Short mmCIF file of C-alpha atoms and ligand atoms in Angstrom, two decimals:
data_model
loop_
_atom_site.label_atom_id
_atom_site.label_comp_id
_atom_site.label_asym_id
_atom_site.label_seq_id
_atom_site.Cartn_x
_atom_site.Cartn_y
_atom_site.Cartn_z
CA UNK A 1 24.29 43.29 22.42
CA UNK A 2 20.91 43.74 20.85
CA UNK A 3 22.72 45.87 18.46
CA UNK A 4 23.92 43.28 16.35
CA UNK A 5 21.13 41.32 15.87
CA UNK A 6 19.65 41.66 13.14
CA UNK A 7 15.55 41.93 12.61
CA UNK A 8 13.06 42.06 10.54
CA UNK A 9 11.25 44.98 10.21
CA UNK A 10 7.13 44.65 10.92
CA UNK A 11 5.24 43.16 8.03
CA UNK A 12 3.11 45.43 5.88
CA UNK A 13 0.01 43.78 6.45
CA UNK A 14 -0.60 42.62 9.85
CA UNK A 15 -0.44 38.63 10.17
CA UNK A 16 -3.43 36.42 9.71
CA UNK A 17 -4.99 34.43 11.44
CA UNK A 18 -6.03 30.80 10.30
CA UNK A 19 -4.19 27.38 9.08
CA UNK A 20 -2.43 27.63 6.12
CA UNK A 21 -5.28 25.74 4.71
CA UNK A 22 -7.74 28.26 5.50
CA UNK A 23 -5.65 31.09 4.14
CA UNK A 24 -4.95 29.60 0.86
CA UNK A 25 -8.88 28.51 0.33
CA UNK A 26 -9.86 31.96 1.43
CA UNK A 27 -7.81 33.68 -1.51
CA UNK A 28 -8.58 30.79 -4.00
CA UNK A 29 -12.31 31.48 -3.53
CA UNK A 30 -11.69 34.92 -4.01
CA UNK A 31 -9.99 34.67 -7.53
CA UNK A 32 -12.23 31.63 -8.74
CA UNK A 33 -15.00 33.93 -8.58
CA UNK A 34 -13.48 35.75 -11.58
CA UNK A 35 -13.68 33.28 -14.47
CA UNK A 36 -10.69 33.39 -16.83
CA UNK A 37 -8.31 34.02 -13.88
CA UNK A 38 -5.52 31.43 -14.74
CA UNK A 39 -3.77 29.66 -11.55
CA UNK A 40 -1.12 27.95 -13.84
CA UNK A 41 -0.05 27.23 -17.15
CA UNK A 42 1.69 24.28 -18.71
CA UNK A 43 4.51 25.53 -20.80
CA UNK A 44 5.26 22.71 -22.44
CA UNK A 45 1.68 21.64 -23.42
CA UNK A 46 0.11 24.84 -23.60
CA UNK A 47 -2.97 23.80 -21.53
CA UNK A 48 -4.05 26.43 -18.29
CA UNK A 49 -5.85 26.00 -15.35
CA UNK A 50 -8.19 28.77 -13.96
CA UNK A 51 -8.77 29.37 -10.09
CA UNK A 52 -12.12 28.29 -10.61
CA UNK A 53 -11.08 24.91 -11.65
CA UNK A 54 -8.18 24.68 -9.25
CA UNK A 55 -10.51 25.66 -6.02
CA UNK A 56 -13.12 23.41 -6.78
CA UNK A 57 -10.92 20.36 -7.39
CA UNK A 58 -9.25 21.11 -4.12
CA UNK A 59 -12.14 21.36 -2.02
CA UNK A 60 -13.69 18.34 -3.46
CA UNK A 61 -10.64 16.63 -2.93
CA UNK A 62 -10.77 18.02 0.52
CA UNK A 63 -13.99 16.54 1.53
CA UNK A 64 -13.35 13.12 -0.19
CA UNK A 65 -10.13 12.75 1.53
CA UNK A 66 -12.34 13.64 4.99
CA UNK A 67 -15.21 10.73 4.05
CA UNK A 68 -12.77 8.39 3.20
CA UNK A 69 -11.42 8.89 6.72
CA UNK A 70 -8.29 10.87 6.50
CA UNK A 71 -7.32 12.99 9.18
CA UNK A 72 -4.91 14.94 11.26
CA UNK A 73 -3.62 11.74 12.44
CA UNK A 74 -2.61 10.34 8.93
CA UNK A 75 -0.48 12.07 5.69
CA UNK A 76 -0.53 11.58 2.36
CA UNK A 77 3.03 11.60 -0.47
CA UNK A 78 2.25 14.17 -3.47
CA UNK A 79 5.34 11.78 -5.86
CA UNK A 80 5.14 13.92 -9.44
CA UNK A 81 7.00 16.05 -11.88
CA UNK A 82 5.69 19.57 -11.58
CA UNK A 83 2.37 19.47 -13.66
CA UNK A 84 -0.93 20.73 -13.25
CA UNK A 85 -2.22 18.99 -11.02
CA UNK A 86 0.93 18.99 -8.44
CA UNK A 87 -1.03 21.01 -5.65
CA UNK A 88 -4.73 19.84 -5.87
CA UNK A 89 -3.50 16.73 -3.19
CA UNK A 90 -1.66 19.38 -1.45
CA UNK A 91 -4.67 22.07 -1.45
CA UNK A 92 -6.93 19.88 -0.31
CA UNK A 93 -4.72 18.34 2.50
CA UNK A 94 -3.82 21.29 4.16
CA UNK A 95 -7.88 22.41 3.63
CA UNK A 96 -8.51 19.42 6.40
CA UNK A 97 -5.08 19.54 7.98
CA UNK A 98 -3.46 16.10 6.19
CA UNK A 99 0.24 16.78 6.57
CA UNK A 100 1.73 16.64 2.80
CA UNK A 101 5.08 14.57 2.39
CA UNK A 102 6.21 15.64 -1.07
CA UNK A 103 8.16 12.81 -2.59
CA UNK A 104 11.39 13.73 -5.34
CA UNK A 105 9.94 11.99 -8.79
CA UNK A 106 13.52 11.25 -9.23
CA UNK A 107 14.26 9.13 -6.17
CA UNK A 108 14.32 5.16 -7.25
CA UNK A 109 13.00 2.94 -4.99
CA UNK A 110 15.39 2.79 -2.58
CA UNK A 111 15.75 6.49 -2.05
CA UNK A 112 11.50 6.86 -1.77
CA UNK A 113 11.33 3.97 0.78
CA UNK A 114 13.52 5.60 3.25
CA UNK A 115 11.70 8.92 2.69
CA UNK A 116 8.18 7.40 2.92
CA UNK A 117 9.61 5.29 5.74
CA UNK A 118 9.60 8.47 7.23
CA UNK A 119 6.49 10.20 6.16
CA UNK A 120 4.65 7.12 6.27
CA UNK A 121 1.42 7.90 4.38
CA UNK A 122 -1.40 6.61 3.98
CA UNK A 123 -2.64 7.85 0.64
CA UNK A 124 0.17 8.09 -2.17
CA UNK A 125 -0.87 10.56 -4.88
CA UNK A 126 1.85 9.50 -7.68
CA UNK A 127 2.06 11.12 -11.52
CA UNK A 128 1.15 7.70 -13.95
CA UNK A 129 5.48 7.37 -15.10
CA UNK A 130 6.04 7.02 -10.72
CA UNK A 131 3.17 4.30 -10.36
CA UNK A 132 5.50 1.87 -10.86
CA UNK A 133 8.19 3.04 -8.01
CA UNK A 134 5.12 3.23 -5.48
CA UNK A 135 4.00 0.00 -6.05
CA UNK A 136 7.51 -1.31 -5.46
CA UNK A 137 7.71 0.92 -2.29
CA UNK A 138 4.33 -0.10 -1.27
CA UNK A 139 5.71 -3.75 -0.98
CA UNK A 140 7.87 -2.83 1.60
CA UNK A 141 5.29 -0.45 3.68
CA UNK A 142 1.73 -2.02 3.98
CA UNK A 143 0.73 1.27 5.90
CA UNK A 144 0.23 2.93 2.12
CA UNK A 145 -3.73 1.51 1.82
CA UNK A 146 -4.16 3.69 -1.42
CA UNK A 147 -2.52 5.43 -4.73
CA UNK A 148 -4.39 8.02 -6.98
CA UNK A 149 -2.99 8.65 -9.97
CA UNK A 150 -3.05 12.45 -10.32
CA UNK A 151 -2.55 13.09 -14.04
CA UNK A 152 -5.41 10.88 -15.88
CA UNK A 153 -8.93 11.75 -16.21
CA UNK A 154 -10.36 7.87 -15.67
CA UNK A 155 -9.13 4.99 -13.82
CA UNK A 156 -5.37 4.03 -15.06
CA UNK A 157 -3.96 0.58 -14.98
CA UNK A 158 -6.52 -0.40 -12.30
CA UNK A 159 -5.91 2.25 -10.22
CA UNK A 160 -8.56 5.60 -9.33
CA UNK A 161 -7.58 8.99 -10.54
CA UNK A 162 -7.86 11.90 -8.37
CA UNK A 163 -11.84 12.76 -10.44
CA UNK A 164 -12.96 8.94 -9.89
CA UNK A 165 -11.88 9.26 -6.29
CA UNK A 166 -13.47 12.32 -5.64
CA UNK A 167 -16.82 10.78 -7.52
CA UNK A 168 -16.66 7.70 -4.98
CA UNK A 169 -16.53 9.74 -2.14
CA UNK A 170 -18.51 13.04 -2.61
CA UNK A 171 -21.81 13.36 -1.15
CA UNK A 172 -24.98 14.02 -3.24
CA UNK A 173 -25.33 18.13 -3.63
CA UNK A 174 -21.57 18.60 -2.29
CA UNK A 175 -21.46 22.06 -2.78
CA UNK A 176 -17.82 23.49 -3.15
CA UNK A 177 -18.42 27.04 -2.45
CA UNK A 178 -20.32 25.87 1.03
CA UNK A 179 -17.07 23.77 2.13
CA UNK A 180 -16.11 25.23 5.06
CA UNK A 181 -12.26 23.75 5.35
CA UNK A 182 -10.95 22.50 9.31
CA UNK A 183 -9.85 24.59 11.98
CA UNK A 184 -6.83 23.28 14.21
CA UNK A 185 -3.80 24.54 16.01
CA UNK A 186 -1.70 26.08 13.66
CA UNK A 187 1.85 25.49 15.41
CA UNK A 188 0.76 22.30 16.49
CA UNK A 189 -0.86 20.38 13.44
CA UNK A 190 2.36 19.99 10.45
CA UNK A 191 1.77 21.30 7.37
CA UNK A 192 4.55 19.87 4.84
CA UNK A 193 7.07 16.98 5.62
CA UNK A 194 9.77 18.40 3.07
CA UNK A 195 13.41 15.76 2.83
CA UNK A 196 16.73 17.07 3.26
CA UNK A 197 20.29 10.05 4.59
CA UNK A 198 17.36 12.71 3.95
CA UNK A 199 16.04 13.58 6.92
CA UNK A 200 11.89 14.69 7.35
CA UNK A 201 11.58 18.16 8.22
CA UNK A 202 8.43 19.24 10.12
CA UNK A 203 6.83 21.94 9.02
CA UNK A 204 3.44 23.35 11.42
CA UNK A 205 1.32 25.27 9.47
CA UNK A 206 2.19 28.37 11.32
CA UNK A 207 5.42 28.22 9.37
CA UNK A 208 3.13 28.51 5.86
CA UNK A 209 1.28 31.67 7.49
CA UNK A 210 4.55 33.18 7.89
CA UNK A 211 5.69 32.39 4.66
CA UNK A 212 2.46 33.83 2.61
CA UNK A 213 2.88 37.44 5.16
CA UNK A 214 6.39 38.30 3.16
CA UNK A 215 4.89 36.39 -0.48
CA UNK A 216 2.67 39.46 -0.89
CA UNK A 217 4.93 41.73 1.22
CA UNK A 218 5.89 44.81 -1.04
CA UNK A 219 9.35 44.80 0.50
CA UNK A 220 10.01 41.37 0.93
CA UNK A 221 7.77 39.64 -1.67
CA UNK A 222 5.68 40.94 -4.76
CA UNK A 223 3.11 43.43 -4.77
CA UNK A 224 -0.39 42.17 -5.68
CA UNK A 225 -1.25 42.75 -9.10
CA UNK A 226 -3.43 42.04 -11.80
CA UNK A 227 -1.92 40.44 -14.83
CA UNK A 228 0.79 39.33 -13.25
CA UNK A 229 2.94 35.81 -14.08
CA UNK A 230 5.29 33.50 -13.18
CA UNK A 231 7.77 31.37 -14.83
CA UNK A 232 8.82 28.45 -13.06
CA UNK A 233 11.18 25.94 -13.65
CA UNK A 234 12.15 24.92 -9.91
CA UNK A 235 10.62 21.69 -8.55
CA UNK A 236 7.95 22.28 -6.93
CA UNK A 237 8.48 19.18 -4.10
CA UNK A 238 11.61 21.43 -2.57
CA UNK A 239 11.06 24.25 -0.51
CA UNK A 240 12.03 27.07 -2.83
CA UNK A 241 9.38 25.79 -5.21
CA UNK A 242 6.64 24.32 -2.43
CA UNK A 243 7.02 27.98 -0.89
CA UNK A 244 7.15 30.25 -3.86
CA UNK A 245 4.24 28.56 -5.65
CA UNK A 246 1.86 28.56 -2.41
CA UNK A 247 2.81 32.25 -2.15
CA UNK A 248 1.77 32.74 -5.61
CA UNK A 249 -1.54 31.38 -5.45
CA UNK A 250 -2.12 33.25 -2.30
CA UNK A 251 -1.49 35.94 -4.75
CA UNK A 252 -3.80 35.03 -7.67
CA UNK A 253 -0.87 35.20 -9.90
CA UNK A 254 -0.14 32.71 -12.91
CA UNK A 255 2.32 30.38 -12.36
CA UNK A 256 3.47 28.95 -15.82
CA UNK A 257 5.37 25.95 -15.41
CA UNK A 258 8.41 23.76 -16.33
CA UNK A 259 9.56 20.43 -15.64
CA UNK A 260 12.25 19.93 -18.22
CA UNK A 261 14.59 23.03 -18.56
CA UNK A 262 15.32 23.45 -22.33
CA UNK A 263 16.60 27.24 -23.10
CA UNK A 264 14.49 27.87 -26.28
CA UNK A 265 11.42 27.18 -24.65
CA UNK A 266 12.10 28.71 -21.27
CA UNK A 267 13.06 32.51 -23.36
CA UNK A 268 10.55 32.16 -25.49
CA UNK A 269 7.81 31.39 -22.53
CA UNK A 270 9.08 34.58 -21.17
CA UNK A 271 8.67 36.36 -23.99
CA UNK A 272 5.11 34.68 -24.83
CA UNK A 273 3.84 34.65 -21.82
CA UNK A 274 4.76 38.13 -20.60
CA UNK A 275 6.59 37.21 -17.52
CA UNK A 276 7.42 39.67 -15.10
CA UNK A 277 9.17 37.04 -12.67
CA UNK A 278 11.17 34.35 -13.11
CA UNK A 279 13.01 31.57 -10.84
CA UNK A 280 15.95 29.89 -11.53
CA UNK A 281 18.50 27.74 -8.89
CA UNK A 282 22.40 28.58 -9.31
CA UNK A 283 23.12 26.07 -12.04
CA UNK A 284 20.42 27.49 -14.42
CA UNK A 285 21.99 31.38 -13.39
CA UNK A 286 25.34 29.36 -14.46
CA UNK A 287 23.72 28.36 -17.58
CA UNK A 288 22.12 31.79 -18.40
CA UNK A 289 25.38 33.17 -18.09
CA UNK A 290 26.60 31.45 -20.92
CA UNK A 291 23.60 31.89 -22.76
CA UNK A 292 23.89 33.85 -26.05
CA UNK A 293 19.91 33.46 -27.21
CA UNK A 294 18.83 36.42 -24.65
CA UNK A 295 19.48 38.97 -27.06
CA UNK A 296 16.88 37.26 -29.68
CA UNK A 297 13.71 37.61 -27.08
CA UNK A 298 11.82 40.47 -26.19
CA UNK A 299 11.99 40.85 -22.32
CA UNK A 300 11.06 43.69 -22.17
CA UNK A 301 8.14 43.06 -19.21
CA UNK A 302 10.37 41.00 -17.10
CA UNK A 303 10.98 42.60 -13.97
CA UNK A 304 12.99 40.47 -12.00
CA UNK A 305 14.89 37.05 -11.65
CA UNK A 306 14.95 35.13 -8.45
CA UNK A 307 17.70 33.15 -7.54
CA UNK A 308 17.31 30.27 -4.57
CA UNK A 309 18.24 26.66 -3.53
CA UNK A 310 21.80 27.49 -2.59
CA UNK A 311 23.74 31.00 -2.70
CA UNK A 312 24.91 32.37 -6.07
CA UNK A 313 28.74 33.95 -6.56
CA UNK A 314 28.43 37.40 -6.91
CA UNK A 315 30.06 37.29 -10.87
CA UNK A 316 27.55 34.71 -12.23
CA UNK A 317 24.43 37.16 -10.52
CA UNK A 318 25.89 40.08 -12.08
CA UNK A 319 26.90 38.50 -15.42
CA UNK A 320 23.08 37.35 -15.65
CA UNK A 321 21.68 40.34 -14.53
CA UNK A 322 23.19 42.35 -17.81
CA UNK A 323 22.05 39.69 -19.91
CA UNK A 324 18.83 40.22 -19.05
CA UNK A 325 18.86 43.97 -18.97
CA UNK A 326 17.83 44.16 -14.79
CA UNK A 327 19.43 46.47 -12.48
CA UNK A 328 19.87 43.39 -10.44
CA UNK A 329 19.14 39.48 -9.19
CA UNK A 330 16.64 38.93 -6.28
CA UNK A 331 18.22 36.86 -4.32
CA UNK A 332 17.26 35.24 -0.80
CA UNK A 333 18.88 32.32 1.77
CA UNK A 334 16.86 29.41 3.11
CA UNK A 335 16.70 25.74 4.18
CA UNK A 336 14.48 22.83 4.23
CA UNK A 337 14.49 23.62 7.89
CA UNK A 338 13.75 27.05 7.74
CA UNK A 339 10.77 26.79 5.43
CA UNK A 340 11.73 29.28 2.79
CA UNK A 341 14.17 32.08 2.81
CA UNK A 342 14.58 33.70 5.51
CA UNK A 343 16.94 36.66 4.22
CA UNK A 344 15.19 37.88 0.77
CA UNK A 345 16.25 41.14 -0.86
CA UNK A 346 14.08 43.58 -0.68
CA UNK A 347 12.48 45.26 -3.67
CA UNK A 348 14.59 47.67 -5.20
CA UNK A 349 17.04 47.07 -3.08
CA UNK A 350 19.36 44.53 -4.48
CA UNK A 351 23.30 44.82 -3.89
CA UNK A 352 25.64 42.64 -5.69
CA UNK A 353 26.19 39.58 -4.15
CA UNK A 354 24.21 39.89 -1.02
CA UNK A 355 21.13 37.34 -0.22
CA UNK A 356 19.50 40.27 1.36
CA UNK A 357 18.00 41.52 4.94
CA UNK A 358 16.13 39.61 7.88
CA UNK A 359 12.80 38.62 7.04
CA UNK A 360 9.64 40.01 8.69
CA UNK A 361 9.15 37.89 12.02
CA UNK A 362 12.94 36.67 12.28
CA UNK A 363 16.52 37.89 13.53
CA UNK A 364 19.32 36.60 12.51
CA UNK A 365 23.43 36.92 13.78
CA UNK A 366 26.77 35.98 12.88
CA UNK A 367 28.45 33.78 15.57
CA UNK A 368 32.58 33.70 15.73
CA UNK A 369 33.72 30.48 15.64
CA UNK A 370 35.98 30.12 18.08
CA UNK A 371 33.92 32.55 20.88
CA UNK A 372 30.24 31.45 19.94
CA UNK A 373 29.73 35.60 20.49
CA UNK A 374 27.69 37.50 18.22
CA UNK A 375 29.62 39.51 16.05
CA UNK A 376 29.49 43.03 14.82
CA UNK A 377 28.92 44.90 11.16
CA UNK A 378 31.86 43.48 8.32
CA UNK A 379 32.73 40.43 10.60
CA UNK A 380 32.39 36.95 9.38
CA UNK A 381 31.57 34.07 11.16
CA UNK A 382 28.50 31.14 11.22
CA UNK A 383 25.17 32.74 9.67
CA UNK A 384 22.24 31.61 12.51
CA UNK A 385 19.06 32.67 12.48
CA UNK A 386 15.71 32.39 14.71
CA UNK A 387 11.84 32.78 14.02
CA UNK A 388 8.39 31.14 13.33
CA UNK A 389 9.44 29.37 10.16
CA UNK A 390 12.05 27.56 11.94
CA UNK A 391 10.45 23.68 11.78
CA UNK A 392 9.66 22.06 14.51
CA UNK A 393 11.86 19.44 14.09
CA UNK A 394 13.14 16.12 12.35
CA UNK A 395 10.89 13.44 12.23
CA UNK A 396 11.84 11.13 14.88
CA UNK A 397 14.93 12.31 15.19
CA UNK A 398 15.50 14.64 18.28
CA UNK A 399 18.96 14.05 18.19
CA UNK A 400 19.61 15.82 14.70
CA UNK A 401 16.96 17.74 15.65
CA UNK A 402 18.87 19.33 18.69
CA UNK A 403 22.10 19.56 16.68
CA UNK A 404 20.88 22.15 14.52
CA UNK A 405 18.58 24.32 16.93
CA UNK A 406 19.70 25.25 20.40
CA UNK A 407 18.28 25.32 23.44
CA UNK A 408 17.50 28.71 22.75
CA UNK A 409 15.64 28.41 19.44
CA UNK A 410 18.48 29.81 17.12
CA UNK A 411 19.23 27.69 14.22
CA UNK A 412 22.91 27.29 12.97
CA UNK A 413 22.79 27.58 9.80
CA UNK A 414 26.47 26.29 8.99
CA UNK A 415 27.18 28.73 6.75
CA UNK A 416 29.58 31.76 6.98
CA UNK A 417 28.11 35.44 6.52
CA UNK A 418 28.17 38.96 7.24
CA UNK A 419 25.95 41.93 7.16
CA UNK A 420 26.54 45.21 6.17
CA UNK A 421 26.04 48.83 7.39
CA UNK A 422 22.43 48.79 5.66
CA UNK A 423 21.93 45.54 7.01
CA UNK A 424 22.14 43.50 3.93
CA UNK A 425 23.66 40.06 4.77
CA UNK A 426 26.35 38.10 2.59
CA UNK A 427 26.92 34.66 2.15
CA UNK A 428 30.82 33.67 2.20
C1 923 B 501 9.76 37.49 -4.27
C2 923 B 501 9.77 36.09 -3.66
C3 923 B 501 9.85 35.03 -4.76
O1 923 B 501 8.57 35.95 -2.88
C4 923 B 501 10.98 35.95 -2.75
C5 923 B 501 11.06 34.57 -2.09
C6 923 B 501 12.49 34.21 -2.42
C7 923 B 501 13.21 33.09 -2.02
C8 923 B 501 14.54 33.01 -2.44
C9 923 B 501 15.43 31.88 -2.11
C10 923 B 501 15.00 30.63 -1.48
O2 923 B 501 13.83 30.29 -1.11
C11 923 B 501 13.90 29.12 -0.63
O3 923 B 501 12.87 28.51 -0.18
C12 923 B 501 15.20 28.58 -0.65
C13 923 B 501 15.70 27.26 -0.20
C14 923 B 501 14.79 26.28 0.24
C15 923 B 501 15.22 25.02 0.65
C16 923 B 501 16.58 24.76 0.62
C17 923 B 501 17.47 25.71 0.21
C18 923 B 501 17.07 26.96 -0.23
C19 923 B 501 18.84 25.11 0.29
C20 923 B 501 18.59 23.67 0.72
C21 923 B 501 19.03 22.65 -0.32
C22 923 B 501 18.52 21.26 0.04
C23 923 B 501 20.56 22.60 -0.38
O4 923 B 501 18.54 23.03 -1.61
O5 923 B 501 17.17 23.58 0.99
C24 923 B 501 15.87 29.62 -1.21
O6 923 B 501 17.31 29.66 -1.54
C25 923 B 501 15.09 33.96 -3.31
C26 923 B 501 14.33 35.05 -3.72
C27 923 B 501 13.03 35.15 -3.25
O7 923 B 501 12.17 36.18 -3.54
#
C-alpha cells in the first residue's frame, strides 16, 4: 500500500552533482570572494573568521595533507571543542576525499581508543587541552604517525600546528584559488566516520550531498540570505552539529559559536549578534523553559529555534516557544546512522509536538509491531525510514550493521511514531 508511505516531496533545486568536498569548496570560493563575509564567530572571545580566511586555510590544508601522502585510503580524527578552527581539517579532508573521524573532546582515554580503534587515523588533528589524551591513545595505536595541534599559531610543545604544517608541505607559488579539489565516487568514498560500545558509522559523501539539497531548501531548510546568522551551541563532532554547520557554510551564513553553554552569554549573543536561528538539544529547551532572563533581551530578529539530538515533549517546545515570542519550534528526527534528520518541519509549518514531514529524497512508514505491516494515518507503531542518507554501514561490523537496515534498505529506527492527515509525523 503505497498509500501509506510516506515521501518526500522533490527538492527545490535539483541535486548536484560532485563530492561533498567539491560542493562545499565551490560555495566557499564563492563567498571568500566577498571580503568581510564572516564564516563564524567566537562568542566567547569575540574573534571572527571570514570565508576568505576559512577557504584558503582549507585548501592549503587540502594540498598539504595530499603531499604529505594522505589519501582515500587513510583518515584523519578532528578531537576539539567547537572553536574556530573545528572544520579547516574537515574542509580540507573531504576537498581530497580523507574520511573525517570526529573524536568527542570529552571521551578520556579509554573511551577515544576504542573510537580511534575504529577510525584508525593516520593524522590526529587535536585542540592543545586534548594533546595530552592523544598521546596516551597514540601509545596504544602506532598507526597514528602524526598530531597537529589545531588551535596555536606556531609549533606547541614540540608538536606542528595546522600553519607550520601547511608551510612544510606547500609548494612554492601554491595558489589557493587554482586548487582544483579530487574527484571520486561519491557513494563509494566515506565522508564522516561519526560514533554512536560506540559504534563507527559510515557516512559516503553522497549522504553530505543530500544533506546540503534540504540545508538551503526553502521548505525543508533556510532560504539563502544575506545577513543571515547562526547561534550555535551544539557540538559540532555529532551529527546535528557536523550537519547543520556544513549546511551553513554551504549557505554563506555566520555561524557564531559556543562551547560552554552559560545563559547570559547565549541571550545576549542573540541579541548582539542579531540571530535569526538558533540550535539548542532537549536539555537546553528544558533549561530555556525555566529561564526567566528572556524577557530582558531584545529578540526581536530571531526567527526560529531548532530543536535536535533526541525528540522534545510537546509541553517543554511549546513552553519555549512563548518565551521566545515564535509561533513555534523547528523541530526534526535523525540518527548518527541516518546522517541528519530525516523528518524536519517545514517552514511555516510547525505543529505542536510533531518532528515534521519526510525529507526530500526519503520515505518513511510506521511498522506494527506485532504484524511488521505498514500502518495507516493516526496508528502507532516502529518509525522506519529509507533513503540516500542512510550510512552505509558500521565499521566492521556487518552484523550490527544488518540489525538495523534490512534486506530491503529500510532502517528501523526503534522508535514509535505516527503521521498525521497532513503528513506531519510524531514521535511517541
Ligand atoms: C533548518 C535546518 C537547521 O536546516 C533543519 C535541520 C534540522 C535538524 C533537526 C534535528 C536533527 O538533526 C540531526 O542531525 C539530529 C540528530 C543527529 C544525530 C543523532 C540524533 C539526532 C540522535 C542520536 C543521538 C546519539 C541519541 O544523539 O544521534 C537531529 O535530531 C531539527 C531541525 C532542523 O532544521
Amino acid at each position: 500500500d503505497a498509500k501509506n508511505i510516506k515521501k518526500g516531496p522533490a527538492p527545490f533545486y535539483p541535486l548536484e552533482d560532485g563530492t561533498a568536498g567539491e560542493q562545499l569548496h565551490k560555495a566557499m570560493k564563492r563567498y571568500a570572494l566577498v571580503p568581510g563575509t564572516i564564516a563564524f564567530t567566537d562568542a566567547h572571545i569575540e574573534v571572527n573568521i571570514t570565508y576568505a580566511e576559512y577557504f584558503e586555510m582549507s585548501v592549503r590544508l587540502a594540498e598539504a595533507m595530499k603531499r604529505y601522502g594522505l589519501n582515500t585510503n587513510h583518515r584523519i580524527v578532528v578531537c576539539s571543542e567547537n572553536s574556530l578552527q573545528f572544520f579547516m581539517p574537515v574542509l580540507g579532508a573531504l576537498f581530497i576525499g580523507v574520511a573525517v573521524a570526529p573524536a568527542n573532546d570529552i571521551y578520556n582515554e579509554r573511551e577515544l581508543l576504542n573510537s580511534m580503534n575504529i577510525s584508525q587515523p593516520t593524522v590526529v588533528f587535536v585542540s592543545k587541552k586534548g594533546l595530552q589524551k592523544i598521546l596516551n591513545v597514540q601509545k596504544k595505536l602506532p598507526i597514528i604517525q602524526k598530531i597537529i595541534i589545531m588551535d596555536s599559531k606556531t609549533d606547541y610543545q614540540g608538536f606542528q600546528s595546522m600553519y607550520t604544517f601547511v608551510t612544510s608541505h606547500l609548494p612554492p607559488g601554491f595558489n589557493e584559488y587554482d586548487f582544483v579539489p579530487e574527484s571520486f565516487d561519491r557513494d563509494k568514498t566515506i565522508a564522516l566516520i561519526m560514533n554512536s560500545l560506540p559504534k563507527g558509522v559510515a557516512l559516503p559523501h553522497r549522504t553530505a550531498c543530500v544533506r546540503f539539497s534540504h540545508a538551503r531548501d526553502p521548505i525543508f531548510g533556510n532560504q539563502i540570505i544575506p545577513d543571515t546568522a547562526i547561534l550555535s551551541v551544539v557540538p559540532f563532532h555529532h551529527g546535528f552539529g557536523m550537519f547543520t554547520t556544513l549546511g551553513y557554510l554551504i549557505c554563506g551564513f555566520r555561524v557564531v559559536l559556543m562551547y560552554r553553554f552559560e545563559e547570559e552569554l547565549f541571550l545576549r549573543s542573540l541579541q548582539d549578534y542579531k540571530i535569526q536561528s538558533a540550535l539548542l538539544v532537549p536539555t537546553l529547551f528544558s533549561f530555556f523553559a525555566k529561564s526567566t532572563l528572556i524577557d530582558k533581551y531584545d529578540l526581536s530578529n530571531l526567527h526560529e529555534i531548532a530543536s535536535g539530538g533526541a525528540p522534545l515533549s510537546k509541553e517543554v517546545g511549546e513552553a519555549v516557544a512563548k518565551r521566545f515570542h515564535l509561533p513555534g519550534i523547528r523541530q526534526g528526527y535523525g540518527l548518527t546512522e541516518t546522517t541528519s534528520a530525516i523528518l524536519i518541519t517545514p517552514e511555516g509549518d510547525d505543529k505542536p509536538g510533531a518532528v515534521g514531514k519526510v525529507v526530500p529524497f526519503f520515505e518513511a512508514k510506521v511498522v506494527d509491531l506485532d504484524t511488521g505491516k505498514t500502518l495507516g494515518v493516526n496508528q502507532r507503531g516502529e518509525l522506519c525510514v529509507r533513503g540516500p542518507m542512510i550510512m552505509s554501514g558500521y565499521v566492521n561490523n556487518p552484523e550490527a550493521t544488518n540489525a538495523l537496515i534490512d534486506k530491503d534498505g529500510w532502517l528501523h529506527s526503534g522508535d514509535i511514531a505516527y503521521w498525521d492527515e497532513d503528513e506531519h509525523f510524531f514521535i511517541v
